[PDB]
Amino acid sequence: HHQKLVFFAEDVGSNKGAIIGLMVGGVV
Amino acid sequence: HHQKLVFFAEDVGSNKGAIIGLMVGGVV
Amino acid sequence: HHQKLVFFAEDVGSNKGAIIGLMVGGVV
Amino acid sequence: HHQKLVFFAEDVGSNKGAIIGLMVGGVV
Amino acid sequence: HHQKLVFFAEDVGSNKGAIIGLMVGGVV
Amino acid sequence: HHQKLVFFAEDVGSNKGAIIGLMVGGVV
Amino acid sequence: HHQKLVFFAEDVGSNKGAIIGLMVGGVV
Amino acid sequence: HHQKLVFFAEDVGSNKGAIIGLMVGGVV
Amino acid sequence: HHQKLVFFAEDVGSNKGAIIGLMVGGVV
Amino acid sequence: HHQKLVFFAEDVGSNKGAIIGLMVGGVV
Amino acid sequence: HHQKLVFFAEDVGSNKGAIIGLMVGGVV
Amino acid sequence: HHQKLVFFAEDVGSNKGAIIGLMVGGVV
Fold first, then answer.
1. Which SS3 state, helix, strand or coil, does residue B2 take?
2. Do H19 and C9 touch (CB under 8 A)?
């Protein structure tokens, strides 16, 4: 009477890229 | 009387790309 | 009467990339 | 009557990348 | 000959809510 | 000869809600 | 000779709601 | 010949909420 | 010929909430 | 010919909340 | 009547990368 | 009637990288 259960979870809400807010430039 | 169950989940709401807010430039 | 259960979880909300707030530059 | 249970968890909310606030530069 | 410049940025990639990976329960 | 410039940015890629990966339950 | 410029940006790619991957339940 | 510049940045990638990896429970 | 510059930054990558890895419980 | 510059920074990567690894409990 | 249980947890909220607040530069 | 339990935990909230507050430079 064998029995097995497996549960797995990966990469929940991580930032593997970039999140950048503001960029400004140039002569004035 | 064998029995097996598997449950899996990956990549829930991560940012693998970019999220950038504002870009401004040029002479004034 | 064998029985086994496994539960696993990886990478929950880490920052493997960059999160940068402001960039400004140029002559004035 | 064998029985086994395993539970595992890795990388919960660490910063393997960079988190930088402000960058400014240039002549004035 | 007056001149003024202002630059501002807030809340770049923070987690003000929850990021939870796995939930399991019940009799077996 | 007055001159003024303003630049602003808020809430770039934050999680104000929840990001949850797996839910399982029940008798077996 | 007055001159003014304003630039603004808000809520770029945040999750104010929920992002949930899997739900399973019931007797077996 | 007056001149003024201001630069500001707040809350870059902090966790004001919770980041929790695994939850399991119940009779077996 | 007056001139002034200000630069400011706060809360870069701190944890004002909780980061908890695993929770397990129940009779066996 | 007056001139002034100010630079400020606060709360860089401190833990004002809790970071807890594992919790287990219950009869066996 | 054998019985075994294992529980494990690693890398909860550490900073393996960098968290830097402000950078400014240039002639004035 | 054998029985064994193991519990383990590593790297909870250490800084294996750098946490640096302010950088300024340049002629004035």
1. coil
2. no
Q: Which domain holds residue B13?
A: 1-28
Tell me which chain E residues have a C-beta less than 8 angstroms from the C-beta of C12.
19-21
Cα–chain-centroid distance for residue I2? 38
> What is the spatial distance between Cα I4 and Cα H6, in angstroms, rounded to a whole number?
9
* F7 in Cβ contact with E8 (< 8 Å): yes
- In what side-by-side order are the strands of the sheet with F18-23? G18-23, F18-23, E18-23, H18-23, I18-23, J18-23
Residues in chain B, overall count: 28
The reply to whether residue A19 touches residue B15, judged by beta carbons under 8 angstroms, is: yes
* Distance in angstroms (rounded) separating the CA atoms of residues C21 and D23: 8
The sign of the CA dihedral C3, L9, C17, J17 is: positive
Question: H6: nearest CA in chain C?
Answer: C24
Q: How far apart are CA C21 and CA C19, in angstroms?
A: 7
What Rg, from alpha-carbon coordinates, does chain H have? 23
How is the beta sheet containing E10-12 ordered, strand by strand?
Answer: G10-12, F10-12, E10-12, H10-12, I10-12, J10-12
Helix (H, G, I), strand (E, B) or coil at C12: strand
b/e code K1-19 from CB counts within 10 Å (16+ = b): eebebebbbbbbbbbbbbb
Q: How was this structure determined?
A: cryo-EM
Report the CATH number at residue E20.
4.10.230.10
Q: Residue K6 forms beta bridges with which residues?
A: D6, L6
- The neighbour count for residue G7, using CB atoms within 10 Å, is 15
Distances (CA, A) of A20 to C22, F19, G19, I15, L22: 7, 21, 22, 20, 19
Amino acid (1-letter code) at residue I28: V
Q: Which two tokens stand for residue J18?
A: 């809790």
Residues of B in contact with G19 (CB under 8 A): 12-13
Task: Return the HEC string of chain F.
Answer: CCCEEEECCEEECCCCCEEEEEECCCCC
How many domains are there within chain I?
A: 1
Could you count the other beta carbons within 10 Å of the beta carbon of residue I26? 17
Cα distance between residue J15 and residue G28, in whole Å? 44
